[PDB]
Amino acid sequence: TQTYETEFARPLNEVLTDIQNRFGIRLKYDIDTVGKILPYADFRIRPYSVEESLTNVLSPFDYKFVRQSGNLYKLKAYEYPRRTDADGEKMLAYLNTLYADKQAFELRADSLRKEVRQRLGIDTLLAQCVNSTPILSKIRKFDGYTVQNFALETLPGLYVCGSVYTPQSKGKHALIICPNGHFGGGRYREDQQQRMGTLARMGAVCVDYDLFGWGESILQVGSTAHRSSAAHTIQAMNGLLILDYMLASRKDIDTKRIGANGGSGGGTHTVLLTTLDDRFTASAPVVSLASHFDGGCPCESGMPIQLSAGGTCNAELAATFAPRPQLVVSDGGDWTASVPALEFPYLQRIYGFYDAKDNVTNVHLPKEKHDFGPNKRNAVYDFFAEVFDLDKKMLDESKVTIEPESAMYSFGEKGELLPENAIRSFDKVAAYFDKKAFAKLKSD
């Protein structure tokens, strides 16, 4: 019954099936429309445009479409971290109106650094971090580099576990902090060991560490806890405390050569690190950078850092590092497809404010997909070789050992070495962020 008096109301699932048949498209559904009723459904249709029709029937339920290949469309929930290339181009054009030189750029960059840090809440948690003796494994020797595991206590009872990759070559070394993306196996994976081992053979101390609720963090908080705003703050805190610990505990580091490098989520965390800490002298965010995507995981976008200074994006945060050497690796199979046309020229103009366009580079892999495969690693090897004066003759992944996973563990094959004091539920961490969690906890 289509009447004025029943608001010409149709179930949304009938409307969309009807759009699919009428305009001859295919729909992939990543939403469940059960029970959804759209008033005036047929009046929202536009015979000349499948896209207006879809947007007019979906935006009332907070849904959208994303055009796939050919005549296929995916139907999605609104995503606060994800916009379009078009949104990107308007954002970056808008931010270009806020600065015409170094002076104007540098005032906004300082506001961006302060408001990002404030909005992350990291200084609240740093004021509560302890100073206990880090748990260090024995040093394991390999061809031209060694590996040593660490567990560093942050908040009372909370541990970040990682591994340090040290060159065997004599003399002062570069240091590279290496947050990782959501790739299978985390920092334990083959391509992560390859990259840390090659950079260490070439003369860089390299450090990698568990994402919150990955690896041995699972022993304390479980796997679910990773997708939380807590993860965003805790992972940035982890990076900073690890940089502090490396610089205070080691004699072999040249403080003119401190790098950040990571892939996907690790590339988002790389930009966060160079935004939070002025000690970094070079940066390589890999298959990560976009004006129009902030990161899909709450560990990347869970805190509202992109609302800093009236609105920013990871491309502008990356720009605040100017004019320090920075490599952006992009590919044609993900959100970084835009970088050669959009994000890179934006970064070139800002590096331009310092006569240092040559300090920022883009290795675009048009044919490749979202991974940390060999040509991603080769752009990283090449960049740090160049800017940190590392030894390219040592570059050979066949010489890196692929340790089994448990060899990088701090707390034993089965986590049986997990300290007495140690947090064993997410509740203990959540209580720093949410009064509901604190209240659950305080009723023993």
Binding site for Zn ion (CB under 5 A): 297, 299
| Cβ closest to Zn ion, residue 151 vs residue 297 | 297
Provide φ and ψ at 284, rounded to 5°.
-135, 85
Tokens of 174: 């570069």
| Cβ closest to Zn ion, residue 228 vs residue 281 | 228
Minimal distance, residue 231 CB to Zn ion, in Å: 6
| Cβ closest to Zn ion, residue 299 vs residue 422 | 299
Contact 234, 177 (CB under 8 A): no
Minimal distance, residue 299 CB to Zn ion, in Å: 3
Minimal distance, residue 42 CB to Zn ion, in Å: 42
Provide φ and ψ at 439, rounded to 5°.
-70, -45
CA distance 82 to 228: 17
Minimal distance, residue 361 CB to Zn ion, in Å: 27
| Cβ closest to Zn ion, residue 109 vs residue 271 | 271
Minimal distance, residue 392 CB to Zn ion, in Å: 33
Helix residue ranges per DSSP H, 260-330: 265-276, 298-301, 314-319
| Cβ closest to Zn ion, residue 299 vs residue 385 | 299
Minimal distance, residue 292 CB to Zn ion, in Å: 19
Closest by CA position to 192, among listed 419, 412, 432, 400: 400
The helix or strand, by DSSP H or E, that contains position 14, with its residue range, turns out to be: helix 12-23
Contact 361, 345 (CB under 8 A): no
CA distance 205 to 165: 6
Q: Give me the residue label for tokens 């020797």.
A: 141
| Cβ closest to Zn ion, residue 259 vs residue 295 | 295
Closest by CA position to 385, among listed 257, 291, 268: 257
CA distance 125 to 307: 21
Minimal distance, residue 257 CB to Zn ion, in Å: 28
DSSP 137: P
CA distance 349 to 336: 19
| Cβ closest to Zn ion, residue 180 vs residue 362 | 180
| Cβ closest to Zn ion, residue 88 vs residue 179 | 179
Contact 346, 96 (CB under 8 A): yes
Minimal distance, residue 191 CB to Zn ion, in Å: 18
CA distance 346 to 200: 32
CA distance 175 to 247: 9
| Cβ closest to Zn ion, residue 125 vs residue 200 | 125
CA distance 425 to 374: 38
Minimal distance, residue 268 CB to Zn ion, in Å: 9
